[PDB]
Design a binder for this molecule. Structure first.
Ligand SMILES: NCCCC[C@H](NS(=O)(=O)N[C@@H](CC1CCCCC1)C(=O)N[C@]12C[C@H]3C[C@H](C[C@H](C3)C1)C2)C(=O)O
Ligand SMILES: [Zn+2]
Ligand SMILES: [Zn+2]
Ligand SMILES: [Zn+2]
Length: 305
């Protein structure tokens, strides 16, 4: 009982990854890139018309368990790819020329826990030595300025950085995947909520990236594209300057691997519902977000490297 306009539990998303791939075998393939702490398969969808030597864009959702609109968006993206390939000029060009590696739910164990026990859970569900506090923040667990200010050394904290960079199976799986395909991946997109913000590097330190001007301009344009639909207002900028220090993030790690187009999207809303965004807003949120993602994709295509 999957619906793109409702939040779906993991069993349902999992079955959807299988069914959407089987229904669209010339546009989608599915692999498991690793397993979670609790043993769940971490699925990755490769969306695109197969071809030789294609560049790729990587996008993850559901790094954080409670950010349900993020998981909903990755599903929406794949929905749009299969629905509009052959029917809309831009998406057609995109899937011909690029592959999208879409990881619909990174932190599966945490996501299950938000359905069963605690709707507000954020972290993974791994154990910690010397305490009964559970979990590591995957977005403080990447090897980029790892465990500095903005992450916590306290396992009971929401920004706990883990026992070591890539301590979490989920983080290692994602990083291993990108490392194994680094020469093909041209952009990194990470979907989160909330606050209506596009972030680009850096978040692990107060410093601006080599291509700050370009990323500023691209973010500004993507935010403009997004607003055209419903007038939804996003702000944007380097992470540590706009948001806060948040070291060990996947976006900064990917950027330092040489993926120069790297962004974090914080979706709706601005705090009225916060993480508990009503299902009635999934459609509008996803449709407007699609415009910003497509804008960035089209830009990357015009600026291959
Ligand atoms: N990689 C670079 C960007 C990373 C941004 C990313 N943001 S997020 O975790 O997805 N969501 C954000 C949304 C909020 C942002 C400010 C306004 C109110 C909402 C979030 O949960 N942040 C906190 C911020 C602290 C520490 C810990 C628990 C509380 C307090 C909420 C996470 C991330 O901190 O990892
Ligand atoms: Zn998040
Ligand atoms: Zn649509
Ligand atoms: Zn240019």
């Amino acid at each position: 009982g999957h619906s793109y306009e409702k939040y779906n539990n993991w069993e349902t998303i999992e079955a959807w990854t299988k069914q959407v791939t089987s229904e669209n075998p010339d546009l989608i393939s599915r692999t498991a890139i690793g397993t979670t702490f609790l043993g769940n398969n971490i699925y990755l969808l490769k969306v695109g018309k197969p071809g030789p030597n294609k560049p790729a864009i990587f996008m993850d959702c559901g790094i954080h368990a409670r950010e349900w609109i993020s998981h909903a968006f990755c599903q929406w993206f794949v929905r749009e790819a299969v629905l509009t390939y052959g029917y809309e000029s831009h998406m057609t060009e995109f899937l011909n020329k690029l592959d999208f590696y879409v990881l619909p739910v990174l932190n599966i164990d945490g996501y299950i826990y938000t359905w069963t026990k605690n709707r507000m859970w954020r972290k993974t569900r791994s154990t910690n030595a010397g305490t009964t506090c559970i979990g590591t923040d995957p977005n403080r667990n990447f090897d980029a300025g790892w465990c500095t200010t903005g992450a916590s050394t306290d396992p009971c904290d929401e920004t706990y950085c883990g026992s070591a960079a890539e301590s979490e199976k989920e983080t290692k799986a994602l990083a291993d995947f990108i490392r194994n395909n680094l020469s093909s991946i041209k952009a990194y997109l990470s979907i989160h909520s909330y606050s209506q913000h596009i972030v680009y590097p850096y978040s692990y330190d107060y410093k601006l990236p080599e291509n700050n001007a370009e990323l500023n301009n691209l973010a500004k344009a993507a935010v403009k594209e997004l607003a055209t639909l419903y007038g939804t207002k996003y702000t944007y900028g380097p992470g540590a300057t706009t948001l806060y220090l948040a070291p060990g993030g996947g976006d900064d790690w990917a950027y330092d691997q040489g993926i120069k187009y790297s962004f974090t999207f914080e979706l709706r809303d601005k705090g009225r519902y916060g993480f508990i965004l009503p299902e009635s807003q999934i459609q509008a949120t996803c449709e407007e977000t699609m415009l910003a993602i497509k804008y960035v994709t089209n830009y990357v295509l015009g600026h291959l490297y």
